[PDB]
Amino acid sequence: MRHRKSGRQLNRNSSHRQAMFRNMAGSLVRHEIIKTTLPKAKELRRVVEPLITLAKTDSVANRRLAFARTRDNEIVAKLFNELGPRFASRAGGYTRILKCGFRAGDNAPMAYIELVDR
Amino acid sequence: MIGLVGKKVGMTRIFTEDGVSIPVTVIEVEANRVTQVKDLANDGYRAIQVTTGAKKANRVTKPEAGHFAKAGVEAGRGLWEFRLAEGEEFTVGQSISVELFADVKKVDVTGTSKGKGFAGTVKRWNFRTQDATHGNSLSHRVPGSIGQNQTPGKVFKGKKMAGQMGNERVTVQSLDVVRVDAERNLLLVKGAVPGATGSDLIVKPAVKA
Amino acid sequence: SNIIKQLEQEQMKQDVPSFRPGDTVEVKVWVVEGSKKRLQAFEGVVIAIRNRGLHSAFTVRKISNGEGVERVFQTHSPVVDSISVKRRGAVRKAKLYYLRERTGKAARIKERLN
Amino acid sequence: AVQQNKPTRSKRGMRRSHDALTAVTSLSVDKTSGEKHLRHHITADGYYRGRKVIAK
Amino acid sequence: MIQEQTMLNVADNSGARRVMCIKVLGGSHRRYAGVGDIIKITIKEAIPRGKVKKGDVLKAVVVRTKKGVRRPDGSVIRFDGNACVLLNNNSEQPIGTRIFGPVTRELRSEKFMKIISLAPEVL
RNA sequence: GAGGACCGAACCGACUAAUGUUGAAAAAUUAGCGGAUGACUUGUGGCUGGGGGUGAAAGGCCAAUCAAACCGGGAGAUAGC
RNA sequence: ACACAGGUGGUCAGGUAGAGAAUACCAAGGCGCUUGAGAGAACUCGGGUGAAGGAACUAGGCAAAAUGGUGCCGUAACUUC
RNA sequence: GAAAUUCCUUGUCGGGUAAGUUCCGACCUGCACGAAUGGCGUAAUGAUGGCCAGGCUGUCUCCACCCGAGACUCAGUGAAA
RNA sequence: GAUGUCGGCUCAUCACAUCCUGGGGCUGAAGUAGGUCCCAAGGGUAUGGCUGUUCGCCAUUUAAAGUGGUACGCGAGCUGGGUUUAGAACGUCGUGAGACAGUUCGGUCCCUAUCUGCCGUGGGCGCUGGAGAACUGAGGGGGGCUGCUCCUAGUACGAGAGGACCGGAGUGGACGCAUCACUGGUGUUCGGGUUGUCAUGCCAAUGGCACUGCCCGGUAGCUAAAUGCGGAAGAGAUAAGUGCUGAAAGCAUCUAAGCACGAAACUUGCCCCGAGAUGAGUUCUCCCUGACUCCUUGAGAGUCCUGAAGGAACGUUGAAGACGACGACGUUGAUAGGCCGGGUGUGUAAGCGCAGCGAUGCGUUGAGCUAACCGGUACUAAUGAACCGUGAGGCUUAACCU
Ligand SMILES: [K+]
Ligand SMILES: [K+]
Ligand SMILES: [K+]
Ligand SMILES: [K+]
Ligand SMILES: [K+]
Ligand SMILES: [K+]
Ligand SMILES: [K+]
Ligand SMILES: [K+]
Ligand SMILES: [K+]
Ligand SMILES: [K+]
Ligand SMILES: [K+]
Ligand SMILES: [K+]
Ligand SMILES: [K+]
Ligand SMILES: [K+]
Ligand SMILES: [K+]
Ligand SMILES: [K+]
Ligand SMILES: [K+]
Ligand SMILES: [K+]
Ligand SMILES: [K+]
Ligand SMILES: [K+]
Ligand SMILES: [K+]
Ligand SMILES: [K+]
Ligand SMILES: [K+]
Ligand SMILES: [K+]
Ligand SMILES: [K+]
Ligand SMILES: [K+]
Ligand SMILES: [K+]
Ligand SMILES: [K+]
Ligand SMILES: [K+]
Ligand SMILES: [K+]
Ligand SMILES: [K+]
Ligand SMILES: [K+]
Ligand SMILES: [K+]
Ligand SMILES: [K+]
Ligand SMILES: [K+]
Ligand SMILES: [K+]
Ligand SMILES: [K+]
Ligand SMILES: [K+]
Ligand SMILES: [K+]
Ligand SMILES: [K+]
Ligand SMILES: [Mg+2]
Ligand SMILES: [Mg+2]
Ligand SMILES: [Mg+2]
Ligand SMILES: [Mg+2]
Ligand SMILES: [Mg+2]
Ligand SMILES: [Mg+2]
Ligand SMILES: [Mg+2]
Ligand SMILES: [Mg+2]
Ligand SMILES: [Mg+2]
Ligand SMILES: [Mg+2]
Ligand SMILES: [Mg+2]
Ligand SMILES: [Mg+2]
Ligand SMILES: [Mg+2]
Ligand SMILES: [Mg+2]
Ligand SMILES: [Mg+2]
Ligand SMILES: [Mg+2]
Ligand SMILES: [Mg+2]
Ligand SMILES: [Mg+2]
Ligand SMILES: [Mg+2]
Ligand SMILES: [Mg+2]
Ligand SMILES: [Mg+2]
Ligand SMILES: [Mg+2]
Ligand SMILES: [Mg+2]
Ligand SMILES: [Mg+2]
Ligand SMILES: [Mg+2]
Ligand SMILES: [Mg+2]
Ligand SMILES: [Mg+2]
Ligand SMILES: [Mg+2]
Ligand SMILES: [Mg+2]
Ligand SMILES: [Mg+2]
Ligand SMILES: [Mg+2]
Ligand SMILES: [Mg+2]
Ligand SMILES: [Mg+2]
Ligand SMILES: [Mg+2]
Ligand SMILES: [Mg+2]
Ligand SMILES: [Mg+2]
Ligand SMILES: [Mg+2]
Ligand SMILES: [Mg+2]
Ligand SMILES: [Mg+2]
Ligand SMILES: [Mg+2]
Ligand SMILES: [Mg+2]
Ligand SMILES: [Mg+2]
Ligand SMILES: [Mg+2]
Ligand SMILES: [Mg+2]
Ligand SMILES: [Mg+2]
Ligand SMILES: [Mg+2]
Ligand SMILES: [Mg+2]
Ligand SMILES: [Mg+2]
Ligand SMILES: [Mg+2]
Ligand SMILES: [Mg+2]
Ligand SMILES: [Mg+2]
Ligand SMILES: [Mg+2]
Ligand SMILES: [Mg+2]
Ligand SMILES: [Mg+2]
Ligand SMILES: [Mg+2]
Ligand SMILES: [Mg+2]
Ligand SMILES: [Mg+2]
Ligand SMILES: [Mg+2]
Ligand SMILES: [Mg+2]
Ligand SMILES: [Mg+2]
Ligand SMILES: [Mg+2]
Ligand SMILES: [Mg+2]
Ligand SMILES: [Mg+2]
Ligand SMILES: [Mg+2]
Ligand SMILES: [Mg+2]
Ligand SMILES: [Mg+2]
Ligand SMILES: [Mg+2]
Ligand SMILES: [Mg+2]
Ligand SMILES: [Mg+2]
Ligand SMILES: [Mg+2]
Ligand SMILES: [Mg+2]
Ligand SMILES: [Mg+2]
Ligand SMILES: [Mg+2]
Ligand SMILES: [Mg+2]
Ligand SMILES: [Mg+2]
Ligand SMILES: [Mg+2]
Ligand SMILES: [Mg+2]
Ligand SMILES: [Mg+2]
Ligand SMILES: [Mg+2]
Ligand SMILES: [Mg+2]
Ligand SMILES: [Mg+2]
Ligand SMILES: [Mg+2]
Ligand SMILES: [Mg+2]
Ligand SMILES: [Mg+2]
Ligand SMILES: [Mg+2]
Ligand SMILES: [Mg+2]
Ligand SMILES: [Mg+2]
């Protein structure tokens, strides 16, 4: 049973999952739209949107938290200097997912995820 | 004696003045609305059909809506029947409230038990595990033998095996009625009842008593 | 959750003092022996607190007549007549289970000055 | 464990009576580009619900 | 939560210092004895000139347990160790004259009133 | 500064367990295990040949073969089964 | 017999901790092991934690748990000293 | 000396355990020990056989939850007795 | 041209020659407690020490610790201690090789389930116009154990010792079902402490790796050791047994006619499944009220128009789930994520300042962070469509209106 539980295991261990979403969150902040599998995209929402919410309030402590969670100074700077202000008046829902068929190699269901104001 | 349809809100406790904590299941019993009365002449048996709660119109189909409209009542979230005793009479469109239980000491509560999915024999039937060690080969939670030999050369019906567990109708009998609060549409019974929070419950005066 | 909230709120006590893990508290509880009702005190260190509304509890440890004893009180129970803080303790942890392995000088808790 | 008797072609077919595929019930038509597409998916030219959502 | 092979301290001055449960009395397949339950014991250690000898088989009443006791409001009382009071095998009256450490009100009955009266504290 | 000395990697082994048993492997993997300056271990090359070799001896080993190797021949041995 | 968890003699020997060629994390350098995507049933495999009890398990404490370093104090019977 | 030997036999007595066909100490009625196909001892040694205890524990009472790899679903390839 | 062994473990199923519990006759049955026989198979029916043991003896329980059948039930379910390969030794026998249901130490347990069977779960068609619901209940399954204390009553009985039937109340053991409010376990998705090392330029702050590095706590969920509930009462027909009235047989006789009692067995009462119950049942409600052509002329075929109720599909999903299935929701919207507030958990973040040579302490500060929780909120994603399903539903005979 998994009654009421949240989060996807994605056939990985916890350290792999944490690292992969750190990288993928960085890619989405950098490029503003990426293509990935539909389940990974759904999971990435729960990682990326709290980072933007955090970047709404610029302070040394929040920059350090964002650096702890992304380990990329270019990504932290983009968060606090661009994305925070771009989304200062939006109450959540900073990304949108668009389904786009199936991968050639493995028939995996695919989706684009983008920032809403891209 | 008819019963009423309610909803499992959750569990809590009632502290009494002499220092006893009574665990209770909180059951929300909104007014039950009589939608059909069945009798010997037309249906061959005596019962009432009730609805309760509310439903959204675009999820109410035309056949359901016609049934409710004949009754003259608003659509609820489902329909349930209760058989009538010899001296019980009701009329279509009547409302029955939780005050029906005001003087009832004990109740039977029926619900759909929580769903465990496919369960093994240890959990489903309380089978004993075999050795964790002492040489056991791949057989720690497995069922063991399932029969005899050439006689009878088959497995008997009703053999206890792995399969779906829970998610089925269950009645718990003879629960104390701790509180009837008609103003808040509340029934408080002592102890646990089947089903997840939010689920539908059928509550009747206890058959054993 | 409002129905159960109302049911719980009407039962909560209104005069529970503030206390922290590491404090010494005296709890006065009702004891019935036949027809008589009297208060018995239980005083010791608070080693755990469960903050859970009407279901709040706290655990008190003492060494009694040569024997360690723990009582888990249900905070809003009418059996508990009163709680009073005798001494304020200075600890870091929320749960002081390590005190179970300590006696005498090793089990002392510094006073919290404030 | 293994069969004692060779199963028949008839029984093979009976087992496969559940194997057929099902075609997509119907495709959707983008209100701007007019392309057919799987419902709730973008079009091959990158439209969704009449908006050019992605380039190429 | 005492079972066969559980070792218990002795809350009296009978002379026994360590006893082992060898049977939970009072029912077929009965698993556990708690506070206020009678068990069969063997004496595994005793002081030299006491009232009982190492190797004796007799009865005892459990008076303190680590698992503890629950009260009608949900509260719990737990002790640091398991302890019992030795009883004569036939009369089920205590063998010692003194009781050491606190006991609980679960012993408040006609059977264990001597223990209740002798205990330094009753919780 | 002795030692078929001691603890312990490489190196040489193979005491226990799980796995594996149409294997990842026709003898292994994993966790533990023994020796580890010696009657030690290892590279290259040499010598011993089948009723024969070699054997700190288990009928062990002598090319995934051993109470008499392998290949060819007598040979279509013989077979009251 | 395989793009096979096996076997294969010699040489080189950085940093921090460390007695160390053990072990952990790294350097130079080299790699992610030639099916992937989901799900989060029973059961199997490899692991983590467990209330009270503590060998009651079992042929048998099998397996597991446990002990584990350096310095100092201290150490019985027996002995071929 | 009831033994790596004792059939009768779980011999009998003592010890250890609540309870001991095993174990230890004895007795001698040695079915069927016995002096280099050596007798009786023996410090040290042993992945050697038996027995007891402290510690320790999911071995067990009696199982529960969790983390991974399969199992299950989709796409590609595609065996076996 | 192979039907694997003793014992253990796991899982059982039947018989009754009944171990307990239920009912009864006789007793050399005062009572309590027994003996013996009859009826009775509903349910129940030890844990340990020794030994490979089955058995047995022993310890300590229990209402009791039943006897047998099922390939001496069960190794394509587990074990492998014993028996029964190859090594080795003792006693013994033999000149010897060797031997011994004598002993002793050591000694590889394979199989991915086609069919039957069984546990679960779907797809098809049927049930005669289609569709959405609520049911009836033929039939099937589950369940059915019992201790102790108190009252009756120190009464009946008994010289005393002792000590009841019948009836009533309470509280347990074992078993079962549900649940998570409490007490707890888990809680690699939350918070903190800390060792070694590498990195982010460095300080400070952080991250990776080392079993989650090692640990201390812990939310939701799952859960037992946690805590609610259950076994019944009642009814019908009976077993053994006990009778009433009563002749055959002037008496007697429970029986031949007639009538009455009588048990955990039987049929019900309680719980679950259940109309594929093809004997395919009932009730409520909803929907469809066009045109033409052809042939072998009929429950015929075809074309145009029409496309309902409803369903399905797709999407967002769920204490529902292996997949199917089942439930919720799709902008006329709280279905999921995010967001806002709260709770919970951890336990006083960072930065700055003060004290101290410094490690560190103190203030700002119960701070900061906080999963699966609670209350809200259209920010994001749940699309306008399209698809399936039709167009008043056979014959015969009655009854009735017509
Ligand atoms: K179960
Ligand atoms: K050499
Ligand atoms: K030879
Ligand atoms: K060869
Ligand atoms: K030869
Ligand atoms: K390393
Ligand atoms: K799955
Ligand atoms: K699954
Ligand atoms: K002898
Ligand atoms: K002999
Ligand atoms: K003995
Ligand atoms: K000789
Ligand atoms: K000699
Ligand atoms: K050895
Ligand atoms: K030895
Ligand atoms: K049987
Ligand atoms: K009987
Ligand atoms: K009798
Ligand atoms: K029976
Ligand atoms: K025997
Ligand atoms: K057989
Ligand atoms: K086997
Ligand atoms: K077979
Ligand atoms: K098997
Ligand atoms: K061996
Ligand atoms: K067959
Ligand atoms: K089927
Ligand atoms: K009773
Ligand atoms: K709980
Ligand atoms: K919990
Ligand atoms: K670090
Ligand atoms: K920095
Ligand atoms: K008569
Ligand atoms: K039907
Ligand atoms: K299902
Ligand atoms: K939401
Ligand atoms: K808090
Ligand atoms: K501070
Ligand atoms: K600070
Ligand atoms: K806080
Ligand atoms: Mg959720
Ligand atoms: Mg995979
Ligand atoms: Mg790691
Ligand atoms: Mg479920
Ligand atoms: Mg078991
Ligand atoms: Mg094996
Ligand atoms: Mg295993
Ligand atoms: Mg047959
Ligand atoms: Mg055949
Ligand atoms: Mg198929
Ligand atoms: Mg040496
Ligand atoms: Mg060798
Ligand atoms: Mg190895
Ligand atoms: Mg050595
Ligand atoms: Mg060594
Ligand atoms: Mg030759
Ligand atoms: Mg030989
Ligand atoms: Mg060879
Ligand atoms: Mg020859
Ligand atoms: Mg010839
Ligand atoms: Mg020939
Ligand atoms: Mg490869
Ligand atoms: Mg290779
Ligand atoms: Mg090498
Ligand atoms: Mg180095
Ligand atoms: Mg290394
Ligand atoms: Mg490099
Ligand atoms: Mg798993
Ligand atoms: Mg496991
Ligand atoms: Mg562990
Ligand atoms: Mg434990
Ligand atoms: Mg803990
Ligand atoms: Mg513990
Ligand atoms: Mg212990
Ligand atoms: Mg044992
Ligand atoms: Mg045993
Ligand atoms: Mg071991
Ligand atoms: Mg270990
Ligand atoms: Mg013998
Ligand atoms: Mg003997
Ligand atoms: Mg003896
Ligand atoms: Mg001897
Ligand atoms: Mg000899
Ligand atoms: Mg001789
Ligand atoms: Mg001589
Ligand atoms: Mg001689
Ligand atoms: Mg000689
Ligand atoms: Mg010799
Ligand atoms: Mg000797
Ligand atoms: Mg050696
Ligand atoms: Mg496939
Ligand atoms: Mg054959
Ligand atoms: Mg009979
Ligand atoms: Mg009787
Ligand atoms: Mg039966
Ligand atoms: Mg029967
Ligand atoms: Mg019955
Ligand atoms: Mg023992
Ligand atoms: Mg034994
Ligand atoms: Mg057999
Ligand atoms: Mg049998
Ligand atoms: Mg078999
Ligand atoms: Mg064997
Ligand atoms: Mg033989
Ligand atoms: Mg052995
Ligand atoms: Mg043997
Ligand atoms: Mg097998
Ligand atoms: Mg069907
Ligand atoms: Mg049938
Ligand atoms: Mg039945
Ligand atoms: Mg229970
Ligand atoms: Mg809760
Ligand atoms: Mg906890
Ligand atoms: Mg933890
Ligand atoms: Mg997180
Ligand atoms: Mg952490
Ligand atoms: Mg630093
Ligand atoms: Mg690294
Ligand atoms: Mg590394
Ligand atoms: Mg009758
Ligand atoms: Mg007469
Ligand atoms: Mg009964
Ligand atoms: Mg819409
Ligand atoms: Mg601080
Ligand atoms: Mg910190
Ligand atoms: Mg402060
Ligand atoms: Mg918050």
Swiss-Prot record, chain D:
Keyword Ribosomal protein: yes
GO biological process, one term: ribosomal large subunit assembly
Disulfide bonds: none
Keyword annotations: Ribonucleoprotein, Ribosomal protein
InterPro entries documented for this protein: Ribosomal_bL32, Ribosomal_bL32_bact, Ribosomal_zn-bd
The UniProt record lists the keyword Ribonucleoprotein: yes
Cellular component aspect of the GO annotation: cytoplasm; cytosol; cytosolic large ribosomal subunit
One Pfam family here: Ribosomal_L32p
UniProt region (Disordered), positions on chain: 1-37
GO molecular function, one term: structural constituent of ribosome
Subunit structure: Part of the 50S ribosomal subunit. Contacts L17.
Similarity comment: family membership: Belongs to the bacterial ribosomal protein bL32 family.
Protein name per Swiss-Prot or TrEMBL: Large ribosomal subunit protein bL32
Species annotation: Escherichia coli (strain K12)
Lineage of the species this protein comes from: Bacteria, Pseudomonadati, Pseudomonadota, Gammaproteobacteria, Enterobacterales
